[model samples]
Target: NQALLRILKETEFKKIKVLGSGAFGTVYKGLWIPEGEKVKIPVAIKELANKEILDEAYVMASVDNPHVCRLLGICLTSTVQLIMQLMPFGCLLDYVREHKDNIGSQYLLNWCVQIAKGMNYLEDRRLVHRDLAARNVLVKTPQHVKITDFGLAKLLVPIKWMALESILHRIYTHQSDVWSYGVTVWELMTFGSKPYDGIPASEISSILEKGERLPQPPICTIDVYMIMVKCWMIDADSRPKFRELIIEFSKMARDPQRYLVIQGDERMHLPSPTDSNFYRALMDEEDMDDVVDAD
Candidate 1:
């Protein structure tokens, strides 16, 4: 048990409704009354369906960062449950997609820096978030978001978001996560477009094996796209660490005019169009359900 983790009685928390569900557990929007407090706090309660409590609780309790989701407490009953901070705005992917018309490029750059800062903290602690994507990040406000889903028992791998080495060799490391972070950043840049759109999941490995990377979104500047390109490098060792990424993203966020500019013909070559029905059907089947894990 984590010494810092608060243990709550199951009776003190009132489940509202199902927020989402995944392979191992389901999350609910709930109201929690602390042991000695009368005020009720809105929280996300994750009910573990299996006997073994997921490692997400332990990992979340071990760290504290503004850009990382907070573990509020835990409840041990018939099954274990994790109480987490509630982000009213929901996941980043949906949030960005809903508000893309009003969100400025500067805000997007700053959010990238914030996500990098959280990843940097995890890197410093030697934690690997096997699942890092826009859908796994929650937006507390338009200007704030936090990484979630530290997937220790993540059974299904996200093929589209995976790094080259992770796909070919099952080698997951901080660098592999950095690769995912690049894709996540691409998600941010594109305001939630699916990665490798029009390409079948089955073809991703071959495309990556051939050194083909995701093409830049129309909105992504050359400078930002280059950073993503570095993340998708064939040599995993060549990928930039979160610490380096934080500094680079921070610099870009601070001076957006200099770093967010598009240059002539710098975009990565787009994938040739495949049969729309073939890839679209494959995409629908391959869409992984979002799981809230530790970050």
Candidate 2:
């Protein structure tokens, strides 16, 4: 009750506009007034549908990194709230899609590197980001991307960007996050196109069983696509760790000749996997239709 009272009474912020939204809530851009003073600080507020959510805030508070959004505090009214540092540039998904012509490939590669660094930070803390996609990544500056909408272990979610196993088994792990990271890179490369654009969520499991991954985005370089392949491996253990990606990405950035060779080639050869009976049974329908659309 005391904590609830603090949020409802002590905290003050003016709602500016909705920034990004999800099943849990909508985020708002605003200005916060420090207690006992009139100093205003820019902030973002996430307004949840109910007070049932708190674990997300608990986990977010523990994370401290330049690439992770800072949870300033909480607020309560008719709805539950999480006050956070406002990102001036909005989400990475829109930023890239809208500004594609204004930027070049080098800058995009750097954005990928920064996102890898942020994910590595979470992995180091042993915290699995159940959700890791372009939309969940916010832009603090043109060069920086911060991980958001992490933790909470939410279930029966929007399925488009989720890893194959997570969709089939209701499970989440670091490897699953790696799968999503690849999809996010896919999003960045394609300027925010949805994964499996034509495939229905109900059909994604069968598609994975057939060993068909998302085709290479026209704008994605061959080497980057190879990295995406490693992350999209059906065998979780086969995927590269976020740390390995960090090293590999840095190496690519260092060797322009090698980078050009990899980037210049327009086509990539992808491998197919043998279908397993295990996938068939797991993908069988059971009337589970609670999925929401992925942003």
Candidate 3:
């Protein structure tokens, strides 16, 4: 993978389009002409213009999983770029946007259930996909989903102190990632709404610690809602174990359309094309019971 990361002219690589960006760098869709058409294939390239990461080489090396995105290639030196699989479905976030009406209200809720399956696979690997939001997930095509962005993932098990040993200075445990899954569920429910919309990142930890329920995730069917509620427990230990979550989510997804109908019952206020401020729709306060500790 280090072979791909090299200091070269921009013309050497064909920049297709911008995938996404952050404070560190931007990811672009690029066609790497390694041998002038010999290695021609559609590849998504992440350009890390700047980053403060530890073991960029180690991170890109020795990592492979199907439920998670594959780190196909990387350039560890300056003007860095990491090659990944190009998924056309874009993501659950993008899918809901384009086909929400044709797909209808109930459709998106069932779609998120599949995302849950993908997350469960990652958790089974003892890898916590830190950012489990809709955008971070990619699609191989219309019906397939793959988790992406290991830049934020953490290696659990045998790490001694999970949070203390996190190399990236991010406390991403399997439990915390369950919280991320709940948020991802929320994102699916709101069709791409940001978590803690009005709150700052610095305060998110404190807020979760204070026992405030996360804004409701969309597929509010009795069974699926219960799973999401368990996933979002304020105390990390209170969250469902990954294996249990897998079975629970699978059960909730028995029928995609039925779950969508369930989700529609509560999604009365989702924003339309003209006014997509979905924050209001996500603010449900019905469950007034104490935290469910029945693990």
Candidate 4:
């Protein structure tokens, strides 16, 4: 492959330290020496277990959005490694948790808008990020984050973040990603609290079947929670497309004084439970075991 030949050699990069590891593989912080350049650039190198992992490299190469992680180059040697833009702050979840006390609303909403724009770009390309979640997002700065792990759709099943249709019928669409986007926003609002807290993984589908959804985080404004509500709609078709979300969130980020007012519990509202029993019997015990085992 033409692209394969252009890939950089492992000799070009000097490994720094381990960043983290997951089902995909371990990522390392490294310094890459660009061809014909003496300056070394910091980069993330993900060591792959096999060539199938190149699917992620291909996907990253296709997307050029500022809010999506960029694939710098690929390294083919004794091990397959992906050279990527290094995220200084790591994942959104850890960042939010670490800085919750000092982080402000403006920063949080800005990150949300950035993610929406990135997702809109992916939606335009007809790419479904099946694993959209706070944990999958990386923070490059306080005001910026990028979606990563493009190759994870086949490697991981994030049950708690799945849309009802995805959970019940194994159908993943842009709409399903919108559902997870809502959960991701909830994660941001609550400073990285786990979604569906106190609820078992096995019962998540049944809860969704009842038309119930995640309760608004205490810190989330009604306007923002309303956006999440629309995304959590039981009918996938009713969920706002990524473009619509980008517009809504962008407006909020631009005029936070008008949109980010948090009412003191009096304005909190929960969705009424529905009578739908379609997914009650579809909750497989096997899927729950996978959730328990998933990191």
Candidate 5:
């Protein structure tokens, strides 16, 4: 892939719309028009305006995974651009919020199962998704999901989703990511509700310091919430590994009856989406880093 990163004019990609923005940069939907090709395919282009921040393009260029967004190429000239696969279904956070009533519990469960598979891949590769959240996950289709923004975690704590130790010492590990993953699970349950809605970002550190976590959402099932709670264990070492999470979620996908195993008797029926096609093929291999995994 040495020839992949090219110095091209920003005009080469026709900017269609702004996707989102951050402190350092903005992301957009663009149309790729490489030389010799009359066709223009859709792509996501991330523009990094801050010179101080790390060049995520360099980090994302190497990733190629089914559960992670694939990096196509990069342009470092008058302006920086990181070309990536366009997820037409939008971010999982918004997708759930907009379609919750029309959607079913099984569809939500399928998303959780798929995300766990993606996280398992990262765990095997020794990569940490410090900012794992529904907002960072993109829906490729109703049954398919892909992780994005793996390497662009900010240095300072973002509050609600950050692990206790990650906030205090700035040390991000696979375990810390597990904690974030738990919060992401909550995000899915709440249909994009803010993790710690009542608490201000500045005061969240003190709350976490007290060992308090966000309460389970009204829609969250006891068994599934139990799995999410395990991820928020104050001690990072106590958090279950992604590999273990993959196994648990996979079991839930296969045997809907076992969904209440975590809290037997608190059984709530949640049928799997008939349209979903989740499978176990993703667990066959070790994962890679963000540059290669892209989340």
Candidate 6:
């Protein structure tokens, strides 16, 4: 009510224009008024179809990091429109898809490290980023990567129930996020391929339930590849903890000598699982119809 009005009035800015959109809502890029030399900075305003349709504001409030977007303000009308940090270049998916040539092997390496850092922050504070994907990782500068979209994120709020299911249930926890993060790592390395590619959401979920692992990082350094493999392990216990992941990736960044050279055929690979009997059953018939691999 009045909160919305005050937020809009308190900030120094002008009218915004719609720049892009997604399942959560439509985001507009516009100007902001800061204290100093900054002339105009772009910001994103996401308006969900229904204001009641979000846990974002609730979840976003819990996140504080360089790897995550800051919640600038919230606008209340008939529906709520959230003001978020804007990355003008859009997401990694857009960036990777547009420039599919000569980006260097370390291009995605940088993105993965930043993402792990963000996840580590969340894990440290005991939060879980349920959705970690390419579109969720927005790029601002050539080397900058930040995590966005708390629409599906879950706060590690205290709740009591069945211990095993609570532990094993598909709830987003630091452990579960490691899995999602692994898929995101895959997307970064693959230039935005879906986790299970051409598979239905139902099938992916079922397979995950049955202890399946997503494909490893196909075209990355051996050490990084091993980290990805560890993250996607079916046994969540075997996956590297956030603290461990941070340490591992940080080491990989500093030690180029630790990298294992890939052979000629090694470059062409993915983390696809060969053991999932029902994997194909989960894909929609029309999903891959229009999806073409440019290569």
Q: Give Cα-based local distance difference scores for all models.
A: 0.75, 0.70, 0.55, 0.74, 0.70, 0.59
State the lDDT at 178 in candidate 5: 88
Q: After superposition, how far is residue 159 of candidate 4 from its true place, in Å?
A: 0.7
- Worst lDDT 10-window in candidate 2: 286-295
Deviation of model 6 at 165, angstroms: 8.5
TM-scores for candidates 1 onward, in order: 0.80, 0.80, 0.68, 0.80, 0.81, 0.69
Clashes of 1: 3
- Looking at candidate 4, the ten consecutive residues that score lowest on lDDT are 286-295
Model 2 per-residue lDDT at 88: 74
lDDT by residue (1-295, candidate 2, tens digit) is 2242224343467778887778767888878876689798777877774334454555566677767765657765666677776767789899878965445455456666777877888989888888899988987645446788765446117587778889999788889999999999888877788788877889998888898898887665588789998898889999989889877766665543344333433232111122223332433222221111111
Selected candidate, larger TM-score, 2 vs 5:
5
Candidate 2 wrong stretches, greater than 4 Å: 1-11, 49-56, 152-156, 256-295
C-alpha RMSD (angstroms) for model 1:
11.8
Candidate order by decreasing TM-score: 5, 1, 4, 2, 6, 3
> Model 1, which residues run further than 4 Å from truth?
35-38, 49-56, 151-156, 261-295
On a 0 to 100 scale, what is the lDDT of residue 125 in model 1? 84
Query: What lDDT would candidate 5 get against the real structure?
Result: 0.70
Q: Measured by TM-score, how close is model 6 to the native structure?
A: 0.69
Worst 10 residues of 5 by lDDT: 286-295
* RMSD, one per candidate, in order: 11.8, 13.8, 11.1, 13.5, 6.5, 13.1
Tell how far residue 60 is off in model 2, in angstroms.
1.2
Q: Candidate 3 residues 28-128, lDDT tens each?
A: 77776765557756677777623444344345443454446657665545566667666655666777666544444333443454555556666665656
Please give the range of 10 consecutive residues that has the lowest summed lDDT in model 6: 285-294
Q: Per-residue lDDT of 42-105 in model 1, one digit per residue for the tens?
A: 8898886432443556666776777887676778777777888777788999888996644655
lDDT of 6 by residue, 7-108 (tens): 553356654788777666677776777655668877677766423433445456546677777565765567566777666678888787776543444445
Clashes of each: 3, 0, 2, 0, 3, 3
